[PDB]
């Protein structure tokens, strides 16, 4: 089997991407944030505290003939941005892009933090990291990908995120029309439960490439590119008037600037992030200070190749017995 679904930016900045997902019988379609940095499929639901729902579409298990309470199971998750959610668990039929899993754990939120409530466009998350990170207790549950894997034509999924445009998540096949050149594969460590890999270095603009190992994670659920302070300082030093602002919470730059590109290494291959991908616009409405898309990972404890980096590539998440990542230009 295979599946193929379009993923759409939630706003004009590409702050996140939503993908429609069918849950239950008859189908209830929710727009979920596919997150390769976490391993819970959770949804706004009929159980979510009413004051914490503001415009999201909810899952109502009582209206699904295939829903079953997973008796005794609870979940609770905290993300890198300080957001959180928790609740109870149903099993139900879940389909993505024509690919169906029966008996998927659907984590029903009883509580969500303010950042979730305030984002009316995201109806929940679909985690695509390794199932060792799943938070369901007392019986840990599998991700949608792990449950689908054995049925797929190939044990893979791909992320093809757009810049200010829709893109695609595919499951079970590699669309050879969706990228240019060849795919470079690189090793993955699953030790922390992430798609963790080592970049071979970087360049700023037309500058020379610096060969240096940068361990980090491929995380579709993180907007920006978080790298070591040395790398980030070297990038922003090439932008007149850029500075790190403790008041704003990262590097800012004059909105009048033209940003340089940023290149990262994948083995001997190179992925180029155009400068425009690194512009996250005014810090507040009407400001002439703009927020940067490359930020320091200092104090986060991991480097994160978030959407800024991933949307410059066609990315293969190879879930074979020995997992690997692949990157191609596009």
Tab-separated table of C-alpha atoms in Angstrom:
chain	number	residue	atom	x	y	z
A	1	UNK	CA	0.000	0.000	0.000
A	2	UNK	CA	0.888	3.673	-0.275
A	3	UNK	CA	-0.578	7.009	0.781
A	4	UNK	CA	-0.105	10.548	-0.522
A	5	UNK	CA	-1.466	13.714	1.145
A	6	UNK	CA	-1.007	17.392	0.501
A	7	UNK	CA	0.375	19.501	3.366
A	8	UNK	CA	-0.500	23.209	3.472
A	9	UNK	CA	1.123	26.107	5.376
A	10	UNK	CA	-1.100	27.437	8.154
A	11	UNK	CA	-0.152	31.082	7.490
A	12	UNK	CA	1.911	33.387	5.286
A	13	UNK	CA	5.129	32.647	7.203
A	14	UNK	CA	5.051	28.814	6.936
A	15	UNK	CA	4.870	28.645	10.713
A	16	UNK	CA	3.588	25.065	10.446
A	17	UNK	CA	1.905	22.788	7.927
A	18	UNK	CA	-1.402	20.946	8.187
A	19	UNK	CA	-2.377	17.706	6.504
A	20	UNK	CA	-5.942	16.325	6.407
A	21	UNK	CA	-6.410	13.035	8.258
A	22	UNK	CA	-9.542	10.848	8.303
A	23	UNK	CA	-10.404	9.412	11.737
A	24	UNK	CA	-13.269	7.070	12.536
A	25	UNK	CA	-16.319	5.706	10.767
A	26	UNK	CA	-17.889	7.634	9.134
A	27	UNK	CA	-14.722	9.649	8.568
A	28	UNK	CA	-14.084	12.731	10.653
A	29	UNK	CA	-11.455	14.840	8.835
A	30	UNK	CA	-9.081	16.786	11.078
A	31	UNK	CA	-6.127	18.891	9.954
A	32	UNK	CA	-3.065	17.646	11.823
A	33	UNK	CA	0.495	18.904	12.174
A	34	UNK	CA	2.756	16.026	11.056
A	35	UNK	CA	5.692	16.111	13.472
A	36	UNK	CA	8.826	14.038	12.855
A	37	UNK	CA	10.049	15.257	16.285
A	38	UNK	CA	7.355	13.537	18.392
A	39	UNK	CA	5.493	10.250	18.535
A	40	UNK	CA	1.895	10.930	19.704
A	41	UNK	CA	-1.161	11.238	17.454
A	42	UNK	CA	-3.399	13.510	19.510
A	43	UNK	CA	-6.476	15.502	18.618
A	44	UNK	CA	-8.819	18.159	19.862
A	45	UNK	CA	-11.925	16.241	20.824
A	46	UNK	CA	-15.407	16.232	22.379
A	47	UNK	CA	-13.498	15.684	25.675
A	48	UNK	CA	-11.339	18.831	25.403
A	49	UNK	CA	-12.125	21.451	28.104
A	50	UNK	CA	-14.592	23.758	26.302
A	51	UNK	CA	-12.718	27.009	27.226
A	52	UNK	CA	-9.576	25.544	25.542
A	53	UNK	CA	-11.257	25.017	22.145
A	54	UNK	CA	-11.387	28.104	19.842
A	55	UNK	CA	-12.216	27.193	16.242
A	56	UNK	CA	-10.526	23.768	15.939
A	57	UNK	CA	-12.374	20.821	14.428
A	58	UNK	CA	-12.848	18.125	17.083
A	59	UNK	CA	-12.867	14.342	17.015
A	60	UNK	CA	-16.016	12.892	18.659
A	61	UNK	CA	-15.366	9.199	19.395
A	62	UNK	CA	-19.015	8.586	20.336
A	63	UNK	CA	-19.927	9.296	16.657
A	64	UNK	CA	-17.441	6.703	15.311
A	65	UNK	CA	-18.650	3.123	15.020
A	66	UNK	CA	-15.028	1.918	15.060
A	67	UNK	CA	-13.820	3.892	18.108
A	68	UNK	CA	-13.002	1.923	21.264
A	69	UNK	CA	-11.746	3.339	24.565
A	70	UNK	CA	-8.252	2.055	25.316
A	71	UNK	CA	-9.195	1.396	28.920
A	72	UNK	CA	-6.906	2.911	31.550
A	73	UNK	CA	-4.566	4.562	29.058
A	74	UNK	CA	-3.555	8.213	29.508
A	75	UNK	CA	-1.072	10.494	27.841
A	76	UNK	CA	0.692	13.764	28.579
A	77	UNK	CA	3.245	15.558	26.434
A	78	UNK	CA	5.389	18.673	26.645
A	79	UNK	CA	7.062	20.130	23.535
A	80	UNK	CA	10.320	22.075	23.062
A	81	UNK	CA	8.352	25.380	22.772
A	82	UNK	CA	6.793	24.939	26.292
A	83	UNK	CA	3.369	23.827	24.940
A	84	UNK	CA	1.584	20.759	26.286
A	85	UNK	CA	-1.483	18.591	26.097
A	86	UNK	CA	-2.897	15.517	27.843
A	87	UNK	CA	-5.872	13.191	27.926
A	88	UNK	CA	-7.137	9.673	27.359
A	89	UNK	CA	-6.929	7.268	24.432
A	90	UNK	CA	-9.189	5.580	21.876
A	91	UNK	CA	-8.289	3.175	19.127
A	92	UNK	CA	-9.868	3.906	15.756
A	93	UNK	CA	-9.318	3.696	12.004
A	94	UNK	CA	-7.029	6.443	10.698
A	95	UNK	CA	-6.361	7.185	7.027
A	96	UNK	CA	-3.807	9.522	5.490
A	97	UNK	CA	-3.858	10.146	1.777
A	98	UNK	CA	-5.619	6.842	1.066
A	99	UNK	CA	-3.435	4.727	3.442
A	100	UNK	CA	-5.510	3.187	6.263
A	101	UNK	CA	-4.445	1.872	9.656
A	102	UNK	CA	-6.920	0.054	11.852
A	103	UNK	CA	-6.521	0.066	15.604
A	104	UNK	CA	-4.435	3.288	15.663
A	105	UNK	CA	-4.115	4.955	19.068
A	106	UNK	CA	-5.901	8.315	18.808
A	107	UNK	CA	-5.009	10.351	21.890
A	108	UNK	CA	-8.020	12.518	22.825
A	109	UNK	CA	-7.084	15.795	24.519
A	110	UNK	CA	-8.789	16.701	27.777
A	111	UNK	CA	-6.422	19.683	28.240
A	112	UNK	CA	-4.286	21.717	25.847
A	113	UNK	CA	-1.999	24.685	26.579
A	114	UNK	CA	-2.738	28.209	25.429
A	115	UNK	CA	-0.586	28.052	22.250
A	116	UNK	CA	-2.768	25.164	20.949
A	117	UNK	CA	-6.045	26.920	21.816
A	118	UNK	CA	-4.853	30.124	20.134
A	119	UNK	CA	-4.041	28.295	16.851
A	120	UNK	CA	-7.469	27.559	15.300
A	121	UNK	CA	-5.847	25.983	12.186
A	122	UNK	CA	-4.240	22.957	13.958
A	123	UNK	CA	-6.630	20.221	15.129
A	124	UNK	CA	-3.844	18.073	16.634
A	125	UNK	CA	-0.502	16.438	15.936
A	126	UNK	CA	0.505	13.259	14.132
A	127	UNK	CA	3.884	12.128	15.446
A	128	UNK	CA	6.387	10.512	13.089
A	129	UNK	CA	9.436	10.099	15.354
A	130	UNK	CA	10.214	6.658	16.807
A	131	UNK	CA	7.537	4.961	18.907
A	132	UNK	CA	9.932	4.830	21.922
A	133	UNK	CA	8.945	8.493	22.514
A	134	UNK	CA	5.193	7.838	22.630
A	135	UNK	CA	3.786	9.071	25.949
A	136	UNK	CA	0.821	6.684	26.421
A	137	UNK	CA	0.833	4.981	29.837
A	138	UNK	CA	0.796	2.269	31.018
A	139	UNK	CA	1.037	0.651	27.544
A	140	UNK	CA	3.122	2.678	25.067
A	141	UNK	CA	1.515	2.978	21.620
A	142	UNK	CA	2.867	2.930	18.069
A	143	UNK	CA	2.931	5.812	15.601
A	144	UNK	CA	0.804	5.783	12.463
A	145	UNK	CA	3.978	5.050	10.444
A	146	UNK	CA	5.047	2.169	12.664
A	147	UNK	CA	1.550	0.639	12.415
A	148	UNK	CA	1.456	1.149	8.605
A	149	UNK	CA	5.022	-0.017	7.926
A	150	UNK	CA	4.517	-3.728	7.316
A	151	UNK	CA	1.702	-2.950	4.775
A	152	UNK	CA	3.676	-0.329	2.821
A	153	UNK	CA	5.307	-1.090	-0.518
A	154	UNK	CA	8.590	0.278	0.990
A	155	UNK	CA	9.068	1.151	4.704
A	156	UNK	CA	9.508	4.874	4.088
A	157	UNK	CA	7.773	8.193	4.184
A	158	UNK	CA	8.862	11.417	2.520
A	159	UNK	CA	8.436	15.068	3.381
A	160	UNK	CA	8.299	17.594	0.571
A	161	UNK	CA	7.405	20.883	2.268
A	162	UNK	CA	6.694	23.972	0.208
A	163	UNK	CA	8.028	27.503	0.604
A	164	UNK	CA	4.921	29.656	0.886
A	165	UNK	CA	3.093	26.844	-0.963
A	166	UNK	CA	1.575	23.412	-0.405
A	167	UNK	CA	3.724	20.277	-0.446
A	168	UNK	CA	3.336	16.572	0.036
A	169	UNK	CA	3.767	13.739	2.550
A	170	UNK	CA	4.020	10.346	0.862
A	171	UNK	CA	3.997	6.975	2.590
A	172	UNK	CA	5.424	3.768	1.107
A	173	UNK	CA	7.106	5.092	-2.032
A	174	UNK	CA	9.667	7.623	-3.236
A	175	UNK	CA	8.267	9.935	-6.013
A	176	UNK	CA	11.262	10.146	-8.364
A	177	UNK	CA	9.557	13.144	-10.127
A	178	UNK	CA	9.582	15.245	-6.920
A	179	UNK	CA	13.337	15.987	-6.716
A	180	UNK	CA	16.326	16.824	-8.898
A	181	UNK	CA	19.637	14.929	-9.029
A	182	UNK	CA	20.134	12.037	-6.634
A	183	UNK	CA	19.150	11.374	-3.010
A	184	UNK	CA	22.053	11.299	-0.517
A	185	UNK	CA	21.410	9.003	2.410
A	186	UNK	CA	22.991	9.482	5.837
A	187	UNK	CA	23.030	7.473	9.041
A	188	UNK	CA	20.455	7.897	11.794
A	189	UNK	CA	20.784	7.336	15.520
A	190	UNK	CA	17.519	6.318	17.190
A	191	UNK	CA	19.058	6.551	20.688
A	192	UNK	CA	17.022	9.646	21.681
A	193	UNK	CA	13.921	8.547	19.673
A	194	UNK	CA	14.456	11.145	16.948
A	195	UNK	CA	15.540	11.138	13.311
A	196	UNK	CA	18.993	12.197	14.513
A	197	UNK	CA	21.781	12.572	11.974
A	198	UNK	CA	25.094	14.409	11.456
A	199	UNK	CA	25.467	17.156	8.894
A	200	UNK	CA	28.937	17.495	7.365
A	201	UNK	CA	29.142	21.299	7.562
A	202	UNK	CA	27.845	24.584	6.294
A	203	UNK	CA	28.417	27.639	4.173
A	204	UNK	CA	27.036	31.180	4.422
A	205	UNK	CA	26.039	32.737	1.116
A	206	UNK	CA	28.752	32.361	-1.516
A	207	UNK	CA	31.358	31.682	1.250
A	208	UNK	CA	33.609	28.669	1.535
A	209	UNK	CA	32.144	25.488	2.952
A	210	UNK	CA	33.231	24.729	6.533
A	211	UNK	CA	33.629	20.987	7.110
A	212	UNK	CA	32.390	20.307	10.637
A	213	UNK	CA	30.092	17.640	12.157
A	214	UNK	CA	26.718	19.012	13.347
A	215	UNK	CA	24.523	16.440	15.060
A	216	UNK	CA	20.825	17.331	14.946
A	217	UNK	CA	17.312	16.118	14.289
A	218	UNK	CA	15.067	16.309	11.237
A	219	UNK	CA	11.922	17.855	12.787
A	220	UNK	CA	8.953	18.833	10.628
A	221	UNK	CA	7.167	20.104	13.728
A	222	UNK	CA	9.723	22.859	14.406
A	223	UNK	CA	9.478	26.004	12.287
A	224	UNK	CA	13.075	27.264	12.358
A	225	UNK	CA	16.648	26.004	11.941
A	226	UNK	CA	18.443	25.832	15.335
A	227	UNK	CA	22.222	25.405	15.119
A	228	UNK	CA	25.261	25.966	17.343
A	229	UNK	CA	25.949	29.550	18.363
A	230	UNK	CA	29.208	29.671	16.383
A	231	UNK	CA	27.405	28.743	13.125
A	232	UNK	CA	24.519	31.120	13.749
A	233	UNK	CA	26.847	34.028	14.607
A	234	UNK	CA	28.784	33.402	11.391
A	235	UNK	CA	25.520	33.586	9.392
A	236	UNK	CA	24.110	36.769	10.950
A	237	UNK	CA	27.511	38.531	10.806
A	238	UNK	CA	26.877	38.688	7.015
A	239	UNK	CA	23.677	40.755	7.491
A	240	UNK	CA	24.172	44.505	8.191
A	241	UNK	CA	22.406	45.475	11.375
A	242	UNK	CA	21.537	41.924	12.515
A	243	UNK	CA	21.820	41.274	16.235
A	244	UNK	CA	20.735	38.876	18.919
A	245	UNK	CA	17.932	40.487	20.957
A	246	UNK	CA	17.304	39.002	24.446
A	247	UNK	CA	14.042	41.071	24.555
A	248	UNK	CA	12.728	39.497	21.324
A	249	UNK	CA	14.247	36.032	21.974
A	250	UNK	CA	16.729	35.593	19.136
A	251	UNK	CA	18.389	37.127	16.133
A	252	UNK	CA	16.597	39.982	14.412
A	253	UNK	CA	17.590	41.881	11.320
A	254	UNK	CA	16.501	44.979	9.411
A	255	UNK	CA	13.478	44.282	7.281
A	256	UNK	CA	15.295	46.218	4.505
A	257	UNK	CA	17.997	43.501	4.302
A	258	UNK	CA	18.538	40.952	1.572
A	259	UNK	CA	19.494	37.719	3.378
A	260	UNK	CA	22.262	35.382	2.193
A	261	UNK	CA	21.588	31.730	1.562
A	262	UNK	CA	22.669	29.024	3.999
A	263	UNK	CA	24.090	25.686	2.819
A	264	UNK	CA	24.206	22.520	4.921
A	265	UNK	CA	26.095	19.324	4.114
A	266	UNK	CA	24.607	15.852	3.761
A	267	UNK	CA	27.602	13.602	3.238
A	268	UNK	CA	29.365	15.041	0.174
A	269	UNK	CA	26.100	16.635	-1.014
A	270	UNK	CA	24.887	20.168	-0.258
A	271	UNK	CA	21.376	21.569	0.378
A	272	UNK	CA	21.014	25.296	-0.195
A	273	UNK	CA	18.430	27.254	1.797
A	274	UNK	CA	17.648	30.460	-0.135
A	275	UNK	CA	17.912	33.674	1.872
A	276	UNK	CA	14.203	34.362	1.517
A	277	UNK	CA	13.423	31.164	3.446
A	278	UNK	CA	15.229	32.685	6.476
A	279	UNK	CA	12.928	35.770	6.665
A	280	UNK	CA	10.155	35.381	9.263
A	281	UNK	CA	8.926	38.953	8.890
A	282	UNK	CA	8.307	41.767	11.354
A	283	UNK	CA	8.673	40.927	15.036
A	284	UNK	CA	5.364	42.713	15.684
A	285	UNK	CA	2.929	44.068	13.267
A	286	UNK	CA	4.373	47.076	11.366
A	287	UNK	CA	7.893	46.791	12.862
A	288	UNK	CA	10.990	47.303	10.707
A	289	UNK	CA	12.796	44.635	12.764
A	290	UNK	CA	12.375	41.164	11.271
A	291	UNK	CA	12.812	37.795	12.955
A	292	UNK	CA	15.469	35.420	11.685
A	293	UNK	CA	14.865	31.858	10.582
A	294	UNK	CA	18.247	30.601	11.772
A	295	UNK	CA	18.594	30.719	15.574
A	296	UNK	CA	20.949	29.369	18.208
A	297	UNK	CA	20.314	25.963	19.711
A	298	UNK	CA	22.235	26.994	22.884
A	299	UNK	CA	20.154	25.957	25.885
A	300	UNK	CA	17.844	23.682	23.800
A	301	UNK	CA	20.384	20.839	24.174
A	302	UNK	CA	19.975	19.655	20.504
A	303	UNK	CA	20.346	21.114	17.031
A	304	UNK	CA	17.102	21.085	15.052
A	305	UNK	CA	16.767	20.956	11.279
A	306	UNK	CA	13.224	22.334	11.283
A	307	UNK	CA	11.032	23.448	8.415
A	308	UNK	CA	13.401	26.240	7.267
A	309	UNK	CA	15.935	23.556	6.356
A	310	UNK	CA	13.641	20.695	5.407
A	311	UNK	CA	11.520	22.679	2.936
A	312	UNK	CA	14.689	23.314	0.865
A	313	UNK	CA	14.900	19.536	0.253
A	314	UNK	CA	13.031	16.397	-0.645
A	315	UNK	CA	13.506	14.333	2.556
A	316	UNK	CA	13.270	10.560	2.848
A	317	UNK	CA	12.572	9.065	6.276
A	318	UNK	CA	13.737	5.477	5.724
A	319	UNK	CA	12.220	3.218	8.414
A	320	UNK	CA	13.970	0.025	7.356
A	321	UNK	CA	15.509	-2.191	10.063
A	322	UNK	CA	18.488	0.203	10.027
A	323	UNK	CA	16.853	3.632	9.591
A	324	UNK	CA	18.466	6.297	7.433
A	325	UNK	CA	17.596	9.821	6.186
A	326	UNK	CA	17.870	10.900	2.580
A	327	UNK	CA	18.071	14.418	1.182
A	328	UNK	CA	17.747	15.620	-2.392
A	329	UNK	CA	17.566	19.079	-3.914
A	330	UNK	CA	14.316	19.990	-5.673
